[model samples]
Target chain A: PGLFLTLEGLDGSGMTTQARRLAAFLEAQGRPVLLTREPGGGLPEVRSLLLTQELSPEAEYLLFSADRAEHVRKVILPGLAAGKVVISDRYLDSSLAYQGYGRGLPLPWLREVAREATRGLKPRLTFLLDLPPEAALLGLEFFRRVREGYLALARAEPGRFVVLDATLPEEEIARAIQAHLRPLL
Target chain B: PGLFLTLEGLDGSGMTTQARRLAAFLEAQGRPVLLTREPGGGLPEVRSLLLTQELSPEAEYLLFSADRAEHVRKVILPGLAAGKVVISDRYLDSSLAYQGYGRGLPLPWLREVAREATRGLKPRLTFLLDLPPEAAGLEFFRRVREGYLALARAEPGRFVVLDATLPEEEIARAIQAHLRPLLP
Candidate 1:
């Protein structure tokens, strides 16, 4: 069986960069991989997900979960059943972080909604790019044009998380991702 | 304290007729009763619940539950505390009938969502105005429409439903007359 790897973090947590690097690293080792993101990773129902700007916290929560439901059903499950590795840049945890912790939603209620959305598919392994709340805002300026939601994803999932120091150089972070990948591979 | 009463059934299961009759019968006794419908209920948040016309079933379920939350918190609870007789024409049971039973939503899941919607405020007494599904559609100018949602309502709760076949006025008069002594 292949792996279901998901990358999650606050806005400045560098999921896109890490996701690409992880995928490229995986392909170099000759492992099959698919890298994708929320809203629409080419799934039609998730087309409702592409807001021009940020969405209200509730709307953001709904759209993310809706997209995840459709995505898991239409894309991830079949691919996993066929023995393909699926790596998503963000997953259900993002909503728990952005909407529940950051936006002050009742955690249990948000968990119920997220479970409804993702069918309770907690990732086998999750990589969380951890950064302090202050550094998170400073790093957020790099992509100021993009919509940044929430400032503390690492706090949301203390159990299933592997937090990386945002200040660590790229090469060392590469070693950490490789270590996380070792058990599954 | 007076009771919070609600009626729920399939579209042609004689809910409208029974609700109206209940209203008239209550007025005859000079009781202060609020008779209303969901979605269009005077509450602002509930008014937004009119998503059935546009959204998917699951989406409709979500919106309806959200509206019900607002309705309970803002309108229904306050009115009840003030000692008014609150008679909703439809409530969470309609969702159980139309979405849960009629549309085949998972029964356990539907009950949980409905419980969350009403904040667990069970009606003092619910009237499940039972009518024959096959004949009920005749008033809609076709037998086809009844076939649409009848399968669900005809489920487990069939045993306790009040049979409605008499003249419309009679049904209302009967319910109001029954409810009179229960009023404050």
Candidate 2:
């Protein structure tokens, strides 16, 4: 009755903008859409901690997992059970790209924790907004690796991913995203 | 350089009291002891949510795991690194007994999370103050007790199963006796 979809990429990639357009497009077509974001979508306290605290890498990831646990069990699961299209702005892939790849934590550890946090739930489709990073020569390197990480994830699960060029016109990207989602309907 | 010690038992079994007494005894002997408790020791906000909110069992355990992760990394590990005797009021075993055995979360899943949270750091000795649960709606708590005993049986070298009903002084004496060879 419902489809779980997600957007993955670095910040400022217009991913949120795309998420909104997708949500409005589907809702106008009479689909029930539960559009949300991570780290704060369901549990604001954990989100706040993520935003403000200086913590060990493990502690930081564990906090995110805690929030993810609540989000999956309470928010995402209920929305899906009620037959609503769940369009999460970020999902497990974000951890894979950002925490695992960006922050240099082991990918396997992140996956192990995600297995518990998300109860093995995954989006039916993930849109990777592949954008050029806004960075200096030094910071650019980190963003490059993060982008590579997103690409690597897409390659690992082609059936679940649709990589997008974020530099395209917003309207054109929207149409492509909608076309990709149309088949899932 | 340090000894990691933990107290495990039902909430009403005076486990915290034993923890306090043990710390006092160690400090009196000029031993460095860092006493702390879990789910709140290092992360009070998490502890607050645990006390006030109604969460799924998995979320509850994950929150506990988050707190334990911080506790182990920031508090317990440092104490151990500095050669201080770290005495936690409760640790992974409490999660096993309460969440896994009592609340019906799978033991294997609980162990997996513990592996990440504690980062494989195990206590040198765990004191399980074994007390009988009161009758009437006691079935679940008995299972909790059983889990504790099972853990103790499985790791006799690391666990000290005590009669929680014994006199306070006697219990303290018994705990100190176990520490006779452990104390630096």
Candidate 3:
């Protein structure tokens, strides 16, 4: 795992902004970077299904896993094998938190499917942009559960997870993440 | 479990004809019928993914299983609950044959994911229109018969395996005869 980094958080949790900043920072430092996202770089049909379908929870997760399987096979692995710093907008943890905690799918079942989908691949580091429910604009109660799911996952694997307050200024969040990456670089 | 029925076979195996005939016959006989297919009826978008995407086998199967999950929830279960005879054009066995046996995904893993996708809702009866690969097509002439037979042998009682080489009328008549003892 030579620097496969992923960003995880709620919809408004600044994951996209942070992913862009980090990718630029790494590239400026002369580290090759492949910045991508889930439902990323595959058949346009699959992306359309994810966006438009009113899917059951099981179906939603399955489609996402399919997208991921294709993305990992076609893009992520090849980029990493070429010694690039691969930064994804979201990865398996997003599914674990949103589908498992928010949508109430079983975590074990999700893990089983995700393991097969990614062939047990995992990121070297994950930046979790922790957001208060109110800031996310989703029902506070729902976002709270999703937030807790992220925290629980980070606690279980402290070394790989870097949790940050997403409400902080964008540069502050970027600076914090870069400081963490400084050691790895 | 209600009268959940499914048709399984190769592409040219008369499943579409037979499935329609069976559903019509049941409806004519005064039994309500809900005729559907896998990747049927939930998201039109999902259906497009199946047709157009050249996915990895794993992604393909996952997409299919997702479609199945939605179809079962939205259409099949409701039909069954309303006391209609539900006849799907293809079901889990099709996945087992095409994806598991044909495409080389592990049977156990396919079953594991399928069990969740369909919520372990096995059909009361499955009509397997068994076709020799040669008879089906040149490209299909590799493994379809073996796959269909494997599925039937795995669940002998639930599967009414029929030789597709038989005349269409004969196969249809046999299918109609088999439904006489529709045990709910």
Candidate 4:
């Protein structure tokens, strides 16, 4: 089985760039890579709704949960079983941080719903690109809670989660992730 | 708050006609009424996706649950608060039957997720227009029907089970009488 890597952070936190860089690093070493993002991987129709609608917090969260389910079963699991490295830009942690902590939905319920959505799939390595500050929906206080939530998650699973200061230069961030991933890869 | 009424059954069952007739009857008597349907009341884009995509059972169920959450919070709740008789053509029971019982997802988890989505909001009267058809393949369809019946039995006061093969007018009359005590 190949390694599963997921990146988590608030908006504009360098997750996308870091995701691409890690994929490039793996591919350059002749490893098969599946680079993807949630609310995008499957159900383009759902992706469109999520982009366009100002849905209720629960409604929006549930849509994201559904999209993740489709993503894991149809996309990520296949890549893993085929011995390909899977790098997803965002996964379950985004919901826990953004909706559960940021929007103040019950974290327990969010985690509960995620069980069916994810079947408790954990990435081999999760990069929590902690950002100090778009984060469009929340103000500074709420954004703080989101970052704090990610930090708490990182602390809870120190072995799997890598907390990185995203304000660092892109190459530095990439190199750090690469260094952390060397043993796992 | 007004009474919440939901109708549930398979595609070919006469739920729509009965829902409209009950609404019309209530409105004719000068009672405020909001007649709507699930996967329709809210989230048009979700509804479009539901029709367009061949989603997994879990995905489809989650979408329906989201739509129901939107429907209850935005549409159904407001109408009820305003003392309008809210009649939903399909609601939570459909998910339990279709996804939990038919497609074979865990019923406990399905019910658990629904607590947040619905806040445990149940229709005072749910017309279970029982049928032996559509939305699932043969054996699966039978399970769906069985699930609906089981739900009806579980909530005897809330459910008014009727054979889909019954005359439409007869069923409508029966529904009106069942809900008469709660009418304003």
Candidate 5:
């Protein structure tokens, strides 16, 4: 069975770059990889709605979760089932951090709804590119809390998490991800 | 405060006609009423997605619930807060019937999500315009009726399950008679 890997971090944390590099690295090693993102890689309308509109936090995450549910069903699961590595740019933890911590929606309720949305699918290896305040656009305090949120999630499932410092050079971040992913591969 | 009323039924059940008639009747009697429907009235994009594409049952209902959550927050709650009789064309029970019964999602999970989506708000009076098999153009009428009956059975006091075979005016009259008592 192929692994389900996810790259997560705050904006400007190099998730996009690292995710692509990791995919190319895995493909170079003769493994198939499916790279995707949230708010509609599988459902395009969700992305449009997300970008163009102002929605309530509950409604906004609900739409994201809905898109995720479909994405997992239509895209991720099929890739993994076919023995291909699936790498999502962001997944459930983003919701936990951004919506639950940043926006202050109830974490328990978010998890409850998320379980239903993704059918309790958790990534096999979650690469948390932990970022410092100066590297991101969000207020220093807000980014600090979001960083803590990601770290707490990593702590809860240490075996599944590979935390990296996003302040490192892009090549270093990619190398760290590739090294961590080796044992899982 | 105003009453939150919802009309639910299968297709061809006259929900559209009765909802308008009831709204008009209430307005004629000097009552304020806000009439709306699911998936579209609250969020226009959702409606377009619903009509033009095929989605997984889970995704389908999630979109509907998202719209409902927005609807309740942006429309329904404000209407009731303003002391207007809020008449929704279709509400939560439609999800239970179509998605839960017809599509076979778990009832428990649907209700759990719906509670959050609507902020635990339910219609005080849900008029279920019950239909016979011949009246609806859907293939799953049996399941839909069972679902509606189960809902009405579960909330007997809050449901007014009307037979669609009755003359339209009689049904309207029955609906109005029920509403007269709700006048503020």
Candidate 6:
């Protein structure tokens, strides 16, 4: 297996765009890459599971866990076992940040459930697409049209976040991301 | 201890009508009875497990099984232990019928999964509301207005079929002819 690299950030934080670009870039380096996303990747069960809305925190967590179990059984493991580079747009860490920290769900409980769901499957390297709250809000509004949840989350736990100045030039931000990713890459 | 009874039919095969009639008729004769349905029961996890479309057959079967597990643990067993007559509108047999027979899924496989789902619980007596294909189709279309999957597809064996051709009271008349003798 080459490596399990995951991309994570708030919705509309360029995670999808960045994940695509990184996978394409990695492939250009002659490495095989399998690009995918949580809640989908050709397993109808996982796709269906994520389609539900308005679930209780507990139910939502369990459903996500169940979705992962099915995903691993059906998709991700087979790809990795065959030596494919797995670049998931979002992994269980999304749940940790968004659902656990942001939603105030019990982290330990979420971890236990998520661990069981993935059955110890985790990324070897994770890229944090961190952005400051106000800049993040403007970008989100321009793109996603929502920022309250991330804003609230940033307010609550200011420490865990790796703050990035989104106002910087793309080259500067790209250099910073590259600095962090070079060793892992 | 009163037995747990469940009735299941596709879309609208008069399950509710027959179920209510059975309940009212049973209560009129003073048999302790409780009636219920699936997918929307009190169990939040089970309820969430259901209501997801675009599911794989495995997913659908698992959701139905999970709903059964929660329903039995929280509702059915407690009712049974308290000695109340339990009459579920549709029960495990629906899985066997819809998933196994109708879908042409293997019967033994369905039985094994169902055994795990119910944890070995089995209904002592089951009523199969039987109607001719055309008449059942008419009834199904008239009320529910949609066919769930396949209405005409059913194995002739397995389920004990009661005639739907009998008049309103006569349906019960035929039921009593057979079922009344079995009741305590």
Clashing pairs in 3: none
Candidate lDDT values, in order: 0.62, 0.86, 0.84, 0.87, 0.86, 0.59
Flag regions of model 6 displaced more than 4 Å.
A1-185, B42-53, B133-159
| Candidate 5 RMSD to the real structure | 1.7
Query: What's the true lDDT of residue A120 in model 1?
Result: 62
Error of 2 at A19 (Å): 1.4
Worst 10 residues of 3 chain B by lDDT: B135-144
lDDT of 1 at A133: 53
TM-score each candidate. 0.64, 0.93, 0.94, 0.95, 0.95, 0.52
Q: What is the DockQ score of candidate 3, to 2 decimals? A: 0.75
lDDT of 2: 0.86
TM-score of B-chain for each predicted structure, in order: 0.74, 0.94, 0.91, 0.94, 0.94, 0.75
i-RMS, every candidate? 5.4, 1.4, 1.0, 0.8, 1.0, 7.1
Question: What is every candidate's C-alpha DockQ against the true complex, given to 2 decimals?
Answer: 0.09, 0.56, 0.75, 0.76, 0.69, 0.06
- What is the C-alpha lDDT profile of model 6 across A26-138, one tens digit per residue? 77777787888876653445456456645444444444555655666567788888887787877777766666655556666565544534657877666666664444433
On residues B1-184, what C-alpha lDDT tens digit does candidate 5 reach at each position? Answer: 8889999998899999999999999899888889988767678788876653667778888888888889999999999999988989999899899989988888888887877789999898999999985678366778888899999998998999899889999999999888777775
Residue-level error in angstroms, candidate 1, position A120: 3.8
Chain A TM-score vs. truth, each candidate: 0.79, 0.95, 0.94, 0.94, 0.94, 0.74
Q: Please provide, for model 3 over A1-185, each residue's C-alpha lDDT reduced to its tens digit, 9 standing for 90 to 100.
A: 35699999888899989999999999889899999997655555567666766778898888888888888888889898898899999899988998888889999899888877897889999999998777762467777888999999999999999999999999999999999989888
Off-target runs (Cα >4 Å) in candidate 1 are A20-71, A88-90, A95-117, A137-159, A167-175, B1-3, B14-64, B78-84, B98-106, B112-115, B134-160, B164-166
Encode model 1's per-residue lDDT on B124-179: one tens digit a residue: 76676656666552443232233223532455332224565667666666666556
- After superposing candidate 2 on the true structure, give the runs of residues whose Cα lies further than 4 Å from its correct spot: A135-142, B135-139
Error of 6 at A7 (Å): 14
Error of 2 at B35 (Å): 1.1
Against the true structure, candidate 2 reaches a TM-score of 0.93
